[PDB]
Each structure stands twice: as structure tokens, then as C-alpha cells.
């Protein structure tokens, strides 16, 4: 197993994992969506609502705001999550648009990760007061508790023999999108680190002159989040859940016979 | 009906880039680069931002006490 | 069972009534159950059978050259209720890999 | 000469809808019933 | 003596109703079973004493 | 689970907003004036007899017999309490109604199989001289199993299963489909327009301008196919898709588009009802009709 | 109490005519109370 | 995670695994194919609405080892394998 | 859900367009639509669509196709009416018969 | 017949007058309709192959100069009933304007009604599907009133 980090942007990462196989990566992938826990607003207690929207819609939006989840403070790999409750209150008054950065928290560590989200517009004399409650939850129970995304693809190499008329266009096309090309005295090697749309001019030679071979055991991943957890950390937390999950199984096996 | 704060397929915040989009496109700046200039890669996130109507300003005027 | 009712699925509604007295209930289970009505009295042929995906999928499963790798065979016999022992055996083609016709 | 193109004809048509109403018959006939048709009966 | 379909249903139906109102059951033990399902196991062993008077 | 016109919908998509809608109804309890001089009087029905519901169905009323807003109503909860005068102390004598001689209930209740929350309680005067109250109640209603969806071409269908987002096949990019349509419905009905709209929505989303599709002078078919390729996608609308259950590419290419659907109002909440043993007619002795009876 | 068409509150009970003393109109809206209610956010 | 044994026979075991989904299930099945003695190993989720948390496993050996022993060694593979990947990860982002 | 006739009808001619037998006659005094010359019994004039559903129908041809499509709509609801009454006759005539032993 | 028509286009007489010449081999009739419930349709008059009133007026329609009231008085648009349409040889597009066409259609895409116009690319579907699709647009859920 050896990695090769291609690019690290603010709250996203793309890398190339090697030395695993098809089964294991899906265990990894599915776990990031459905297991890694975050914080999200569970219920809302309204005190007064003279705004232009119904009670449920505003209540619904409060649950969608991504909240910073400090991973060094409880246990995010535990099978029995902690029931620690945070109270998000707000008292606002029109005119003006209510932003996400106005929410007050009862604990300085859990605040909205992105402060520019419009919640609801208030006109003259319309008061709006509420106390949102946040708890921990998992993605499989409700989609508001999702840390992010995982997409993976087979890493393939395309051999394009120089007998094909106008092979140069492929070189020109590949360079425009940024794919590593190595050239020699027979053909060009194109590494498909991203989607490669072949033009119709070449579809009649698909097979003969041009053939694609899969590299066994090398996957390109794309992980992106929303600001609740650092993207460097998601994979770390994910693997620990996997390990912890399997271990229990052995303990249950002995208690059967 | 103020812009959906998440997309409907790809989980990614989107309300924070609606307004800044709209005023810039209503001055002549071609949409096919404004969207590209912001963090909008796939097209699934893009459909929800392009086609939307934000009727909330008309309805707000009328009242129910 | 959606040729005999002549139902489709775009909102059609059906009703269900439940018989009560012990003679009536018994009578319903022995004489009107679905399995006693696979052949139709109108013409000598089966009425309850495969529909659209059932037929088309059957073609792809049995064409010249539909070699299913070992993992898939194992996975699909457990999806169809049937329950066999360690006789998937014996791997007709092992040239490329050991696989099943 | 370029005859028109379809697109310019669209501008002609466009004027017809904006100026008058889509519900022309119920509105126009009632307006005529108020002046002429009342005194007639 | 092979029953017809209609006679079979009736015999079960008659027998089931007797089983509710008393009328001791043969070996039909398992776990909680409706009076209908009781008549089915008894019939599967060919011990139903009801004979069909055939009109002939 | 989508054969013969059914459609599978992405669980996550429902849960973030797609197709949510609200139902509304409003009741019109007035104040009749009998010619004899008596009147109705909206007051909280004194815990006595003659039509009294007996439980705490009247807990939600205020002092004057009108609810105040944002109080969850359900089942047969009472909205406004009236009291209509019998006007004839000896007219009926229904074998026990001689001693009480009280006052007839007639209070307006919400229909049996509905729920939700009250929204506005108007109160005003009528054209004659009485007082009528109109109370409206709203209902959340999430798109669950059985609701009807249909495009604008004629592909009617019912939601078949609301599968978790993870077990859904996805394209070698970030796209995850929302609605998986049965492939046996396109070359059977002959709706070629459906395929053209799918490609047309993909080009339209990427470019950013909205494709013009008016009959006879719409955007020529060949331009959308020739533009789709130069934007970076196989011309035919197909891609390489990975099956979300196990995880291996399907040995075919899987079509994908952007089609405009629309939710129809034949919602399952207004069809299901059951009868145990109801009140029937007296003179003809037949059971009653409809959901309100 | 009450509240009317684009103005201020009124007194409680009734016996006679219901009119708003300033816009001469007669249509009332029953104002929302000042309590707390638990709305779950699914 | 409770194991309800449905049927036990000579070199054959079918059982329910309460609380699991496609994640752990799929991974456990193809990990068993590296063990040369386990001839057959499958899973299924009967009707995913009424129950999609308890699947049904079937493991068949050749007699020289019990299915119970075979799982314990097989599941151990995952633990060791996942550990290696985690070590590479942490020793990368530096 | 097949017929080779409709797969071909998506990449070739639709063909003629008829109404209960005769070709299209119902129109103006001497022609069908006001876009043809009076007194033309030609192929293109009397309702013959040449383009397919892929390449697209022109305005004259599209209108002709609507005349042939209303035919199927009207009929299907009418044929049911006569059938239902007819069945009531034969049921109330034959329901008494049984097979003796 | 030529006299009354040419008079109407000049704006001398009220615009609701249409004259049609029935043309049997041994019957001649001339009809003048002036009732209150006839269903008409707008068409552009063309003479000698050149459709009357070209881009000079389109520039002014796109500008704020002449509305539709000004057009029908000037003599470009003509309201044709069923009866007057009996003698008209209407064309479709501005490309097939030989020296025989009496009138010329405006945008033909307005043939269909207000709900069937909601279907994109209607000329590519089968006739029964469009009927269903048009009929279902009248039942969707949405916002139709602020
Ligand atoms: Mg049906
Ligand atoms: Zn998206
Ligand atoms: Zn007022």
C-alpha cells in the first residue's frame, strides 16, 4: 500500500490508492457516507413567528446548516454515540435578511461553519425568535448528518498506436484538460486521472488501433466536504470505524458456541 | 421561495453564492464563466442555481397577522 | 399476478375483504388460491407468467457467450431462494479464468 | 432580399398578446352588453 | 374413493368448525395454530372420519 | 421494483427538499338566526349532556370557542363549538330525552382521516347581520410510497421504492441519479421527444443558457449533439456507470439526462380507508357512501 | 382579542356590531398567542 | 450484532446477522474467497423495506475445518488489512 | 413490449393516415387544409406523412397525424359500453346450469 | 368582391366585413357576413410575391411607435373567417412565396392551445401521448397566485 496525493484544495482532496482491490474500497467508500458522524439540528422550538414562511420550512432549513464537529473531544469511532446537546438560540427583527452568522451558540466550539447562508427575509414589524437543538447522528438514519462525498474510479491507461490517422489531436486534446501523457516511438500513453470522452472520429478504430487496459489495483478517489471536518481527517476516522466494527464480530462468534 | 440551502443530489452548500451570481449576471457578464469562476464543478449542482425564481419578494408584501 | 387482474400501476386501486366464519375461511383457502389458477379456462394455456423484464432478462442469461465469473454465480443462487450444497461444479471454461457457461 | 427570418415575425405576434387580453371574449362581450344591449331589451 | 375438489373443501370446512366448539384433536401439537390450520394437518394424514354419501 | 411504469427515487433527494408540498383546507362555521328569535352563541359546551363529545376533544378551544393558532389538530378534534336551540321542547322524545331538555351540540369537527396544524382564524360579519368564522388547517405531506409522478409527455408512474442514496449507481464523475426509469417504456410508446429532452437538459445545464424548444422553429437536433461533445462528454448521452451495491462497472454504458417532472395531486393520503362495521340506512338498510360517511 | 385590516388590536368580547373603529371595515384576524411549541425538523 | 443460527449441518451453516448492512457483508464475503477451503459463501437481503438490517449468510467447507473456525480466521484478515492502509495514510500527509 | 412495426416507424415513413377506412376527405370545399391547391388528389395532399418521429414532422403533416390519433381515443371508450350490457344478457340466461354426478 | 376587400384594407370601412365569392359552374353567390359570433384568424396579406410591410415596421413594432391597432388600419393584417378562407391559398414559411400566394401565415407554432404548448418538441411524439401529456399539465402542483 502506497499513496500519491494529487491535489489538496480547501476542504477537498484527490488521491491515488494502490495495493488494495475492488471489494475493500467499497467498504471504505460506503462507510464515509453512512457512518462518519456530524452534528445537526434535530428539533426547533418556536416562540413566535410572524415571518413570510411556514413553521416547518424555517425549521427544515435550520437542520441543513453544516456545523463544526470537534473530533478531538469525544469519540467519533464509538458504536454508541454521545448524547451531548447544544442549544442554538436567536432573537431577530426586521427589516433585513437573516443570515446564518447570527446564530448564538451555548458552546464556543460548535458554530456554523459557513456564515453567509440566507435563512429567511424579514419585513417591517415581523419578529422571529427560536431555540434550535443540535445532537449527534449518522447518515444512514437521516441525510442531514452527512459529512461529505466519495467518488472513485478505475485508473486506466489508453494505448493509442501511431497508425491511427490524426493521432496528434488526441495529444492536443489531452494537454488541454491536463492529463499526463508519455510519448515514445510507437504510441502515446494516456493516464486517465479524470473522465476521457473519446471523439466520434475515432470510434470506428475503437478496438483495432486503440485499446484500453485496466491497471489492477489502483483507484482514484475524490473526497470533498462542507466544513464540518478537515478532509485529511475523514479517511482516518472512517478506517477506525471499520476496524472497530469487525472486532466486535469475533467477540460475538465466541458467544455462539 | 429562497434558494435551496443544499443541492438536491450533491451535498454542497449553495445559498451563499446565489445573490452574488444574480447581480453579476444582470450586468452582462456571460453565465458560462461566472458559474465556472465559482466553485461549481459538476452539472448536478449547477441546474438548481440556474433555474430558480425566488418569488418570496412578491408574496412577502401581503400580510396575515 | 398482473395479467389476471388486468391492473397496471399508475394509481389503480384494489379492495380487500376478509371472510370470517370458519367454514367460509377454510373454503376460500382450498378452492380459490392463486396456484390453482395458472391455466385459464378460456384457452389451454398459462395465464400467470413472466412479464416484460422476466422475458428480456431471460434472453441475456442464455445467449452464446454469457460467461459468469465465480463470484456472481455464488451471489445469485442465494438471491433466488434455492439452496444448493457445494455443487456449483465444475467450471466449463478455465482458459481466461475458471468460470461458468 | 432576406424575406424576414422567422424570429422577426415573432416580435409582430408578441405585440398582439401583450396589448389585449387572453380572456378577450368574456370581457369584450360584457362591455358591449352594458351599453348597447341593456337599453335594447 | 378419491375425493373431488368440492368435496375436499367441504370436509375441511365442516371438520374445522367442530374443532372450535370442543371435539378432541389428534396429534396436532405445535405452538399455537388456528382452528383452520388444525384441520389441514389432520387431513394430510388421512384420519378424517367423514365419509361422502355419494348420490348413486 | 420499477417494472411496468414505476419509478425509483433517491432517498437523500427526498430528504433535502425535492417535491415537498403542503395541503390546505378551510371550514365555514356560521351563526344561523332562527325566525323565532333564538340564536346560536359560540361558547365552550358546558360539560353536560345532549351531543357532548365527553372526552377532551374540546381542550383546544379558547374562552370564546375559537381556537387560537398553531395548535395541532388531528382525528375528530373540534374547531368551533356551537349550540343550536331545539325550538320545540316536545317534538322528538327519543326515549330518554324528556328529562334533560337541554341544548343541541352541532359543533364543527375536522374530517376523520386528516391531521395538521391550524393557520389563520378569521372572524367577521356576513351580509345580513351574523358572525361567521373561517378556520384554515395546513398539512406537511412528504412524497412517500404511492404518490403519482408524470412527465409532460405521458409517462405516468407511481413511486416504487425509496432506496438509500448509497445503493445507487453513479457515473464516473460526481453525479448520482435521482430517478431511475424503466427502459421498457421508451421504445414501446414512441416518445422520442423524451430522449431529445434528456440530451437537451444536459447541454443546457453545462453551457448556462436555456435551450429554446418551441414547436417547428426550435433548436435543431444536430446542434445539441454536436455541442455536447465539445463540452466534454460522449455524444450519445451515455456514460460509464458503477453499480453502487457491490461495485464494478456495468458492462454497458448507461444513459442519463435532465428531465423536468411534476408531482400530481393523486396522493395516497386521500385514497386509503377501511370499513369495520358502520351505520347503515334505516328505511332501505344499505351502508353509506364516501370517506366523510 | 382581535387585529384587523392593516392596523392595531381591539378589545375582547362581543354583544353587538363588530367593526374596526378606524378603517370602518369589518374583518378580523385572531392574533397568535405568545407560547412555545415543539416542531420537529425532518 | 446478534447471531441467530437458522440451521446447522455437517460442514454447513446458515445464519442471520442482526444489525448489519451491505457494507460489512460484501467485504466479509469476498474476503472468504481467499481461504481455499471455503467452497461457497453468499449473502442476501430478503425484501429491503420490511428488513434491510439482517441478511442471511451461508458458508460451506470441505470437512477439514468447521465454518465457525473458518470465519474467525477469515474476519481476522480484514483487521490486519485495514490496519496497514491506515498506517500508510497517516505516514503520507507530511 | 415490442412490435417490429413501431421500431421501424421511428426511423422510416409513418405511412398513410386513415380514418375508419377512407382516406382524408373531410375538409374545405375541394381540399383538406387551406395550404394546398383546390382539386389535388396527390399523395402528399390527401394525407401521407413522409418524415419520421426522429427527423421530425412538418406543420401540414403534424396536423394530419392528429386526425388519425383521435380515432383510437373515441373508439376504446365506446366498445366497452356495448360489451358490458351484452354480458348481462348471457349471465342471466345460463347461471342455472350444473353438472350432475 | 375585389372592390369591398380593397376598400377594407384602405381603412375606409369598419374592419369586421369579409366577402367571399362562391364559384359554381352555373351558380354565382356573394356572401357578406356581419353577425356576432364568428371565429376568425389573423393572416398577412402578400401581393406580387412580396409580403406587404417588411422590416421598416418591425423596427417600429420593436420600438414604441405603432401597436397592433395601427397595423390593421394600415392594411397588412387581415382577419379571415372560414368563408373568406375558401378563396385564399395560404403559404407557410416566408421561403415558399411564389407569385400565387394570397396570404402568409404568422408563426405557425401557435396552432395548438395554451396547455399543449407546454410540451417541448411536440412534433416528435405520437398523437395519443401528447393528448395525455397536455391533459396532465392541468393537474400539477405549484404556485399560481402570490
Ligand atoms: Mg390503470
Ligand atoms: Zn448536483
Ligand atoms: Zn383597521
UniProtKB/Swiss-Prot annotation, chain A:
GO molecular function, one term: protein dimerization activity
Annotated NCBIfam families: PRK00783.1
GO biological process, one term: DNA-templated transcription
PROSITE patterns documented for this protein: RNA_POL_D_30KD (PS00446)
Reaction catalysed by this enzyme: RNA(n) + a ribonucleoside 5'-triphosphate = RNA(n+1) + diphosphate
Subunit structure of this chain's protein: Part of the RNA polymerase complex.
Cross-referenced Pfam families: RNA_pol_A_bac (PF01000), RNA_pol_L (PF01193)
Coarse class of the protein's main subcellular location: cytoplasm
Keywords of this entry: Cytoplasm, DNA-directed RNA polymerase, Nucleotidyltransferase, Transcription, Transferase
EC numbers on record: 2.7.7.6
Localization annotation: Cytoplasm
UniProt keyword Membrane present: no
InterPro entries membership: DNA-dir_RNA_pol_30-40kDasu_CS, DNA-dir_RNA_pol_insert, DNA-dir_RNA_pol_RpoA/D/Rpb3, RBP11-like, RNAP_Rpo3/Rpb3/RPAC1, RNApol_insert_sf, Rpo3/RPB3_RNA_Pol_subunit
Family to which this protein belongs: Belongs to the archaeal Rpo3/eukaryotic RPB3 RNA polymerase subunit family.
Coiled coil: none
HAMAP family: RNApol_arch_Rpo3
Species of the source: Thermococcus kodakarensis (strain ATCC BAA-918 / JCM 12380 / KOD1)
Enzyme class name: transferase
GO cellular component annotations of the record: cytoplasm; DNA-directed RNA polymerase complex
Protein name (Swiss-Prot/TrEMBL): DNA-directed RNA polymerase subunit Rpo3
Function: DNA-dependent RNA polymerase (RNAP) catalyzes the transcription of DNA into RNA using the four ribonucleoside triphosphates as substrates.
UniProtKB/Swiss-Prot annotation, chain B:
Annotated disulfide bonds: none
Cofactor: Zn(2+)
GO biological process, one term: DNA-templated transcription
Assigned EC number: 2.7.7.6
Main localization of the protein described in the UniProt heading: cytoplasm
Location within or outside the cell: Cytoplasm; Chromosome
Pfam families per record: RNA_pol_N
GO terms for MF: DNA binding; DNA-directed RNA polymerase activity; zinc ion binding
Keyword line: Chromosome, Cytoplasm, DNA-directed RNA polymerase, Metal-binding, Nucleotidyltransferase, Transcription, Transferase, Zinc
Listed NCBIfam families: PRK04016.1 (NF003089)
Function field: DNA-dependent RNA polymerase (RNAP) catalyzes the transcription of DNA into RNA using the four ribonucleoside triphosphates as substrates.
Protein name listed in UniProt: DNA-directed RNA polymerase subunit Rpo10
Swiss-Prot record, chain E:
Chief place where the protein resides: cytoplasm
Pfam families (alphabetical): RNA_pol_Rpb6 (PF01192)
Protein's GO biological process: DNA-templated transcription
GO (cellular component) term, any one: cytoplasm
GO molecular function terms noted in the UniProt entry: DNA binding; DNA-directed RNA polymerase activity
Subcellular localization: Cytoplasm; Chromosome
Family membership noted in the UniProt record: Belongs to the archaeal Rpo6/eukaryotic RPB6 RNA polymerase subunit family.
Description of how the protein assembles with itself and partners: Part of the RNA polymerase complex.
Xref: NCBIfam families: PRK01099.1-3
Record protein name field: DNA-directed RNA polymerase subunit Rpo6
Organism: Thermococcus kodakarensis (strain ATCC BAA-918 / JCM 12380 / KOD1) (Pyrococcus kodakaraensis (strain KOD1))
Recorded name of the encoding gene: rpo6
From Swiss-Prot, chain H:
Transmembrane annotation, as ranges: none
EC number, UniProt record: 2.7.7.6
Function text: DNA-dependent RNA polymerase (RNAP) catalyzes the transcription of DNA into RNA using the four ribonucleoside triphosphates as substrates.
Quaternary structure (record): Part of the RNA polymerase complex.
Organism: Thermococcus kodakarensis (strain ATCC BAA-918 / JCM 12380 / KOD1)
Gene Ontology terms: biological process: DNA-templated transcription
Designated name of the protein: DNA-directed RNA polymerase subunit Rpo11
A Pfam entry, by short name: RNA_pol_L_2
Amino acid at each position: 500500500v502506497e499513496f500519491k496525493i494529487l491535489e489538496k484544495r480547501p476542504d477537498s482532496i484527490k488521491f491515488i490508492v494502490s495495493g488494495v482491490d475492488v471489494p475493500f474500497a467499497n467498504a471504505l467508500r460506503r462507510t464515509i457516507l453512512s457512518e462518519v458522524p456530524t452534528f445537526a439540528v434535530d428539533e426547533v422550538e418556536f416562540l413566535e413567528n410572524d415571518s413570510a414562511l411556514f413553521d416547518e420550512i424555517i425549521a427544515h432549513r435550520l437542520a441543513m446548516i453544516p456545523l463544526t464537529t470537534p473530533h478531538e473531544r469525544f469519540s467519533l469511532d464509538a458504536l454508541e454515540l454521545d448524547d451531548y446537546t447544544v442549544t442554538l438560540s436567536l432573537e431577530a427583527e426586521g427589516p433585513g435578511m437573516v443570515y446564518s452568522g447570527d446564530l448564538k451558540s451555548s458552546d464556543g466550539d460548535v458554530k456554523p461553519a459557513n456564515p453567509n447562508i440566507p435563512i429567511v427575509k424579514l419585513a417591517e414589524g415581523q419578529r422571529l425568535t427560536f431555540n434550535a437543538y443540535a445532537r449527534l447522528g449518522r447518515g444512514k438514519d437521516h441525510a442531514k448528518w452527512q459529512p461529505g462525498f466519495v467518488y472513485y474510479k478505475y485508473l486506466t491507461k489508453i494505448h493509442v498506436s501511431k497508425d491511427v490517422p490524426d493521432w496528434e489531436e488526441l495529444k492536443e486534446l489531452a494537454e488541454r484538460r491536463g492529463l499526463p501523457v508519455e510519448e515514445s516511438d510507437e504510441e502515446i500513453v494516456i493516464t486517465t486521472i479524470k473522465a476521457f470522452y473519446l471523439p466520434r472520429k475515432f470510434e470506428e478504430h475503437m478496438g483495432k488501433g486503440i485499446r484500453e487496459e485496466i491497471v489492477p489495483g489502483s483507484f482514484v478517489f475524490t473526497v470533498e466536504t462542507n466544513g464540518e471536518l478537515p478532509v485529511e481527517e475523514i479517511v482516518s476516522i472512517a478506517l477506525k470505524i471499520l476496524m472497530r466494527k469487525s472486532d466486535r464480530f469475533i467477540n460475538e462468534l465466541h458467544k455462539l458456541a | 421561495m429562497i434558494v435551496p440551502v443544499r443541492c438536491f443530489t450533491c451535498g454542497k452548500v449553495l445559498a451563499d453564492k446565489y445573490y452574488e451570481f444574480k447581480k453579476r449576471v444582470e450586468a452582462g457578464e456571460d453565465p458560462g464563466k461566472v458559474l465556472d469562476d465559482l466553485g461549481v464543478e459538476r452539472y448536478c449542482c449547477r441546474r438548481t442555481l440556474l433555474s430558480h425564481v425566488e418569488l418570496i419578494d412578491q408574496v412577502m408584501v401581503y400580510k396575515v397577522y | 399476478v398482473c395479467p389476471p387482474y388486468n391492473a397496471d400501476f399508475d394509481g389503480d386501486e384494489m379492495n380487500l375483504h376478509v371472510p370470517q366464519t370458519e367454514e367460509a375461511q377454510a373454503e376460500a383457502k382450498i378452492l380459490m388460491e392463486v396456484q390453482n389458477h395458472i391455466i385459464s379456462p378460456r384457452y389451454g394455456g398459462p395465464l400467470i407468467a413472466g412479464i416484460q423484464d422476466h422475458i428480456s432478462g431471460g434472453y441475456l442469461l442464455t445467449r452464446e457467450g454469457a460467461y459468469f465469473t465465480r463470484y456472481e454465480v455464488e451471489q445469485m443462487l442465494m438471491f433466488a431462494g434455492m439452496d444448493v450444497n457445494e455443487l456449483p461444479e465444475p467450471d466449463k471454461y478455465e482458459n481466461g479464468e475458471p468460470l461458468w457457461s | 432580399e432576406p424575406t424576414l427570418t422567422p424570429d422577426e415575425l415573432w416580435l409582430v405576434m408578441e405585440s398582439y398578446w401583450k396589448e389585449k387580453g387572453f380572456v378577450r371574449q368574456h370581457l369584450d362581450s360584457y362591455n358591449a352588453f352594458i351599453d348597447h344591449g341593456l337599453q335594447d331589451v | 374413493f378419491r375425493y373431488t375438489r368440492f368435496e375436499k373443501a367441504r370436509i375441511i370446512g365442516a371438520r374445522a368448525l367442530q374443532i372450535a366448539m370442543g371435539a378432541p384433536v389428534l396429534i396436532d401439537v405445535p405452538e399455537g395454530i388456528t382452528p383452520l390450520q388444525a384441520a389441514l394437518l389432520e387431513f394430510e394424514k388421512g384420519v378424517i372420519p367423514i365419509t361422502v354419501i355419494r348420490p348413486s | 421494483y420499477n417494472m411496468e411504469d414505476a419509478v425509483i427515487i433517491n432517498k437523500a433527494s427526498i430528504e433535502r427538499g425535492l417535491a415537498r408540498s403542503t395541503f390546505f383546507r378551510t371550514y365555514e362555521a356560521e351563526e344561523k338566526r332562527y325566525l323565532g328569535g333564538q340564536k346560536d352563541n359560540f361558547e365552550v359546551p358546558s360539560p353536560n349532556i345532549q351531543g357532548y363529545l365527553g372526552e377532551k376533544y374540546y381542550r383546544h378551544l379558547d374562552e370564546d370557542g375559537l381556537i387560537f393558532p398553531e395548535s395541532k389538530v388531528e382525528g375528530k378534534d373540534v374547531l368551533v363549538g356551537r349550540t343550536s336551540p331545539p325550538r320545540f321542547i316536545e317534538e322528538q322524545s327519543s326515549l330518554g330525552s324528556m328529562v334533560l331538555q337541554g341544548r343541541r351540540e352541532t359543533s364543527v369537527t375536522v374530517r376523520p382521516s386528516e391531521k395538521g396544524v391550524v393557520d389563520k382564524v378569521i372572524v367577521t360579519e356576513t351580509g345580513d347581520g351574523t358572525k361567521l368564522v373561517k378556520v384554515t388547517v395546513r398539512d406537511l405531506r412528504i412524497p412517500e410510497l404511492g404518490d403519482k409522478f408524470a412527465s409532460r409527455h405521458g409517462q405516468k408512474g407511481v413511486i416504487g421504492l425509496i432506496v438509500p442514496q448509497e445503493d445507487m449507481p453513479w457515473t464516473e464523475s460526481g453525479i448520482v441519479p435521482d430517478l431511475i426509469v424503466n427502459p421498457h417504456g421508451i421504445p414501446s410508446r414512441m416518445t422520442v421527444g423524451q430522449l431529445i429532452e434528456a440530451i437537451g437538459g444536459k447541454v443546457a445545464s453545462l453551457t448556462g443558457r436555456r435551450v429554446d424548444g418551441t414547436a417547428f422553429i426550435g433548436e435543431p437536433e444536430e446542434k445539441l449533439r454536436k455541442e455536447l461533445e465539445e463540452l466534454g462528454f460522449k455524444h450519445s448521452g451515455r456514460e460509464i456507470m458503477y453499480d453502487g451495491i457491490t461495485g464494478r462497472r456495468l458492462e454497458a454504458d448507461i444513459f442519463i439526462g435532465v428531465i423536468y417532472y411534476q408531482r400530481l395531486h393523486h396522493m395516497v393520503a386521500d385514497k386509503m380507508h377501511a370499513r369495520s362495521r358502520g351505520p347503515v340506512q334505516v328505511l332501505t338498510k344499505q351502508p353509506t357512501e364516501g370517506r366523510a360517511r | 382579542c382581535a387585529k384587523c385590516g392593516k392596523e392595531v388590536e381591539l378589545d375582547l368580547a362581543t354583544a353587538r356590531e363588530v367593526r374596526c373603529p378606524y378603517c370602518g371595515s369589518k374583518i378580523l384576524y385572531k392574533p397568535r398567542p405568545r407560547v412555545a411549541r415543539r416542531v420537529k425538523a425532518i | 450484532m446478534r447471531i441467530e443460527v437458522i440451521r446447522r449441518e455437517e460442514n454447513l451453516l446458515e445464519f442471520y446477522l442482526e444489525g448489519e448492512d451491505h457494507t460489512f457483508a460484501n467485504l466479509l464475503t469476498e474476503t472468504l474467497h481467499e481461504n481455499e477451503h471455503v467452497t461457497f459463501a453468499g449473502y442476501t437481503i430478503e425484501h429491503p423495506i420490511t428488513m434491510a438490517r439482517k441478511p442471511r449468510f451461508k458458508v460451506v467447507t470441505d470437512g477439514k475445518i468447521t465454518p465457525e473456525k473458518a470465519l474467525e480466521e477469515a474476519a481476522q484478515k480484514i483487521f490486519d488489512r485495514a490496519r496497514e492502509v491506515l498506517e500508510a495514510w497517516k505516514a503520507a500527509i507530511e | 413490449r415490442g412490435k417490429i412495426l413501431n421500431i421501424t416507424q421511428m426511423a422510416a415513413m409513418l405511412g398513410q393516415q386513415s380514418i375508419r377506412g377512407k382516406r382524408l376527405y373531410r375538409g374545405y370545399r375541394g381540399r383538406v387544409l387551406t395550404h394546398f391547391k383546390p382539386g389535388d388528389l396527390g399523395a402528399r395532399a390527401r394525407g401521407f406523412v413522409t418524415n419520421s418521429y426522429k427527423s421530425g414532422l412538418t406543420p401540414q403533416e403534424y396536423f394530419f397525424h392528429a386526425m388519425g390519433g383521435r380515432e383510437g381515443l373515441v373508439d376504446t371508450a365506446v366498445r366497452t359500453a356495448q360489451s358490458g350490457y351484452m354480458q348481462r344478457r348471457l349471465i342471466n340466461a345460463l347461471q342455472d346450469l350444473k353438472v350432475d354426478y | 368582391v375585389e372592390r369591398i376587400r380593397a376598400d377594407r384594407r384602405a381603412g375606409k370601412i369598419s374592419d369586421v366585413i369579409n366577402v367571399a365569392l362562391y364559384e359554381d359552374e352555373e351558380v354565382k353567390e356573394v356572401y357578406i357576413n356581419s353577425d356576432d359570433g364568428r371565429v376568425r384568424r389573423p393572416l398577412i396579406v402578400v401581393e406580387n410575391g412580396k409580403p406587404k410591410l417588411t422590416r421598416e415596421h418591425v423596427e417600429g413594432i420593436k420600438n414604441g411607435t405603432l401597436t397592433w391597432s395601427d397595423l390593421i388600419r394600415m392594411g397588412v393584417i387581415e382577419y379571415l373567417d372560414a368563408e373568406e378562407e375558401e378563396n385564399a391559398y395560404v403559404a407557410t414559411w416566408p421561403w415558399e412565396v411564389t407569385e400565387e400566394h394570397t396570404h402568409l401565415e404568422l408563426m405557425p407554432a401557435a396552432i395548438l392551445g395554451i396547455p399543449a404548448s407546454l410540451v417541448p418538441y411536440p412534433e416528435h411524439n405520437a398523437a395519443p401521448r401528447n393528448t395525455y401529456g397536455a391533459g396532465m399539465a392541468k393537474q400539477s402542483l405549484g404556485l399560481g397566485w402570490a
